[model samples]
Target: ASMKNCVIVSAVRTAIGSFNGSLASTSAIDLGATVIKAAIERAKIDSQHVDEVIMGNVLQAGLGQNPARQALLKSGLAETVCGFTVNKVCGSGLKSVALAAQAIQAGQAQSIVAGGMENMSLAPYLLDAKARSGYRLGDGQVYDVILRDGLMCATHGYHMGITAENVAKEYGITREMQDELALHSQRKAAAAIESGAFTAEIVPVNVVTRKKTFVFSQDEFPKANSTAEALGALRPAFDKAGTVTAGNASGINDGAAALVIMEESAALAAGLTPLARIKSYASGGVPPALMGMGPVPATQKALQLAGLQLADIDLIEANEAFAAQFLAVGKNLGFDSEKVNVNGGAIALGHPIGASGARILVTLLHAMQARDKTLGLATLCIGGGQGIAMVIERL
Candidate 1:
């Protein structure tokens, strides 16, 4: 009885903020609201009719109550609309989408606003309440909750970068190779942004600061001045002799994305032109140490369910968390790298973890529209050795 009938009528994303950059002043709730409101407007849907709002988020440390609920209310949706936030690490955004699709398939709802949001710049440093209650000696240290709760994998007790190193070591992806790929990512992203190729999907934010209110309309990553010489000069960030370096890894970013998703018939009845139809979505797990390779298994399962081959995916948003990670996917999946990230990737666009899964999908749909491509895939490696992928076809 499960028919693949979920359709995406609209997708929009805020311009990515470099760590502590343009959007730093904006709260995650506002970012989420911006996209959700824009998505509903673009889909030409009444906000009151949307049954639910689901958003993915990480670094929920001080964001009080339900982050999703706050954003839903802020988006001017009915207070009666149901909502919740998802936390599957980097996969949270896409996982939110998958769950929304599932809800529609299960006949639980007819329409929903599904996506993700994150503002790493606003993430807090956690103080141990117990420690605060009683005076302790030594240096007082407030832990970075973002690192502790978001990036550090409790399963392996190591930072996520180390996992990128692990994949690089196992896959024989050299430092030169990683840098080469990173350089390409930067170049492609720089060109895309400069050409305003992302204009179609970007929902500009008016970031108000104590200094001044400014329009943050462009991506803050993609160093147009970057060069391989500079990239090669950077030292390893994770391990002493690792291939992963600052230049080869994704930047911590701030942004949000939203998609107006509905049952196919529901969208058709509403006179909404679907941008894509959800073909299949899946998640796969791997060893905690090989987190970078998460996309491989996830995509395989997704392609299997969709009854398609890698070749069928005309454009792929195989997110670039680290150069080694995307390289590993290329090796493991045995797919043409030519089909992946044609408009660039996280390595250049920046990876706003909680929001990246939806960010990539939004970017992919727009890219697919630009390329006039028929099929597209979006995938991301989760922080804790998991991957989530979804296949979509232009409708």
Candidate 2:
């Protein structure tokens, strides 16, 4: 078992689609399988070389048994390959990659395809009447699977946005400050798109239907024309008088991302140029009410584990669960504005729950290469009071 030995050989992500957007019709199975196959193919490794397939999927309501297993089979991998699903809410996708890397580092496996997928639009509504109660006298409780399983802070019985609002209030993050970062994210993401910055990270998604069919390659959520005026004009989404708004909040999205991981020695033998090495990672837990602040401790722990400092990190990809959330993290951690989220964030990229963790990883490594930087950190605050952070070194 070697430290910093697990390498990402190939990474790919589907173009993120907003909820009920072009990819809404696509299932998590297809999105997961698509990235899995692409990651394997791009890594130039035989399918049999993959020892396991792990995919993070949060809303598996109507999907078949074992969403990862379904995706693994669809990828045409051998049935004997160990395949499993992971659910860590917002951290699920990155957690999949972490587990894959941990296995490689421990010599438990040589190669793995790990990533996350979520089709929020396809998350089905459920009638909870028959599950627990005898023939109910009144209305059967109906649950919106996406909200109930993904966005809601079940412990507090409130939307995740409320947690963000609490972070804003307690952290003294003002509405104007949140809107500034929101606008910044939009501008940065739009510029990146215009310059074809994401070309290396993105794999085109093909959609075919009777009404319309075409290849969807570009990100759809970045508003090329959004402005501070527009952001300020938008009202709050969760609390009637709160600062967090549709303008400042992360998008409920549909997408997936995957990467091929293996021991660095194994990759070199296979003639693969590893994209990045897993340097170190850490997970942290905090109070559910201040969930958005989880990234601070997570990053601190990861940096300590890596024996590095904030100045040593060349790039940062902190998921923008909300502008206030990211702002609060930046305020506490003091990240250089220029080094953080240079290509926009979840606010503009559309946060696809389970997909975002790996999506940002792919984005970060590609960005590190694009910028000729050597060190990058991808961290995200999770729903349900958790955080995950990873340090990656470009190979």
Candidate 3:
């Protein structure tokens, strides 16, 4: 059954490009604005009806007064509709959606355009030497408090690599096991892409490179070229003797994803078809060092709030931040690997920071429609020890 008050009326996504790929040359604001317009066009609704537009961004911070609002203005939405930016590190996008849902649930807003965007190519590689110098020099998360203090990973005391390593050590996860999971991820992603499972949400992005513009649509990953044997040969990335590697982890990428959410009655009044309903959502704190395991506890709490059980969930999409943490969450929550990220995850696809969570939510909806299923959940662990979960009902 659909939730009493709200539903996800539409979802759309831009082609995910490699960090320095086609989208690198474009401004994040332009890319964001363009995608928002595309989503609105796809939703078949007049812009005047939208009350708010919420966007999540990581690398685009400090580039403007309010990037989200700027994107909305650029997208051709009226200035009358308010816009805001959300910063939850990697989970920014989902958090934006969660907040948008809150506004409607509280009768604060009637319709919202919510999603996330990222242009990692333009985001400078970061460093935090002073902040990390506390643990025997270069042992903390940052180099200077000025810039370092703002990074969720810096405040958390460990880089994502180190955090995943910690989880591996604490959980007794191994290199071989991690490699196997990576293999599975690659195979699944390849299959999903080949079958055109993402067609509904992945909107082709037109871009210019080398003085000429072109349409860059397909996911940057999902290669028919790479193999598991190739992945196995790669070395450990974070710790010299540890298991996590570039092959089994996510890389910074560029992309944008959007969703239209509105109150149930308003949606019907507008004559729109709902793809899913937001049943419940929640965010919780965790030891920042174990950030990747965020989905475990988040899922539990979301299920509790929705009055549902793990067994009732038909599919899962654990953001495969690292093979170690992905497996840890599975072990702790007893999540079925076969049912989770069934078409692959961040490891196989790229993780565009802010756009990732929104992409995952759209992907979850796609999966639900394919199986003619109901009750799918999406969750993520944030940069500063925050965990979030949102349950969707396929109505």
Candidate 4:
């Protein structure tokens, strides 16, 4: 049903920065709600016309109860606007957006503000033993995806880096290739920023800092002078002898992103300028051992659901969690590397777990507008053996 006639009336996002440590000033709820508010404002739509806000969140630590609803209620999205929060790990935010679009196409609603937010900067590190297993274990480590899949995906029960390295080994990807991809991503990101490609759809956020209670409104990771040598100097993060360096994988981040989607009839009647048509979407699961390639199957399913093929897709936004992972997926799918992640990705920008999907869609919209073309796909391979893929057609 997501493919029938759902269209994205507007999409916007904040420039991504490494969360918590780098973007330490932002608040999760505020940042999340602000993007929805900004999207509505940018679309020039009345709040009364909106129907729902579907938000995604990963770390529920400081988010409290009903984070999505709180954002909607505070953003002045009308008292009747229902809200829902979803968490599918890295796909949390985008999964919300996709579900919202699917709902509209299925005739469940007319309008929705779909997005997500996270400020990893101040997320709580809970004692899993107390929270889940009762009080006997003392202050145990937080129970997260990394810990859940530790043994299945990693060697000697190491961190995610070792798991990612395992994926590289299975796919026969090399450190040099990953580094080259990282270099290209940085170059593309620099070019995209310089050309103002992202500025067209970027919504600047004035985040209040916890440290100084100040606000900042620009991107925090657009390095203009970074080089391969500079990236090479950084040691591997997990294996100490591996290729998954800090420069290759996406950093923990903080930010929010949003999209306004509505039925075709409603949009046209209101004289709203739709940005793109929601084509199709799909989700799939793969072996957690080599989960990074999950996008391959999910992308295939999305294209099939849309009744379109890869040759028909004009652009692609394949989230680069790590260059090695992306390399594995791209080569396996035989997709043109140049056509994917056109504006760089999490590697050069950042990945705020729940925000990555919506962020990718925001970028996909820009890629469509920049090329004056229609039909693009945004796909991501999430942690814990999941993949989500969506197709967009410029309207």
Residue 309, model 1, lDDT: 95
Report lDDT (Cα) of residue 79, candidate 4: 75
lDDT of 3 by residue, 1-395 (tens): 33347789888888777768877876667777877888788777778899999999877544679889999999999989899998888788899999999999888888899989888777653354454444554444423321232333776555678888888999988887888888888888888888998877788777767778888777875545566688779898878888899888777678888899989888888888888889998887788888877877788889998899988998887787788888988899888666799888888888788878888898888898998989898887776676788999999
Evaluate model 2: give its TM-score. Answer: 0.98
Ranking by lDDT: 2, 1, 3, 4
- Give one digit per residue, the lDDT tens place, for model 1 in 152-253: 887888989999988988999999999999999998898898888999999999877778988988898878788889998998898877778889999889
In lDDT terms, how accurate is model 3? 0.81
Error of 1 at 333 (Å): 0.3
Per-candidate Cα lDDT values, in order, are 0.91, 0.92, 0.81, 0.80
Cα deviation of 47 in candidate 4 (Å)?
0.9
Kindly list the per-residue Cα lDDT of model 2 for residues 115-209, writing each as its tens digit: 99999988998878586656447556778998899999989999999999999999999889999899999999999999999998899999988
- Candidate 2 — worst ten consecutive residues by lDDT sum? 131-140
Q: lDDT, candidate 2, residue 115?
A: 96
- lDDT for model 4 comes to 0.80
As for candidate 1, its clashing pairs are none
TM-scores, all candidates, are 0.98, 0.98, 0.91, 0.91
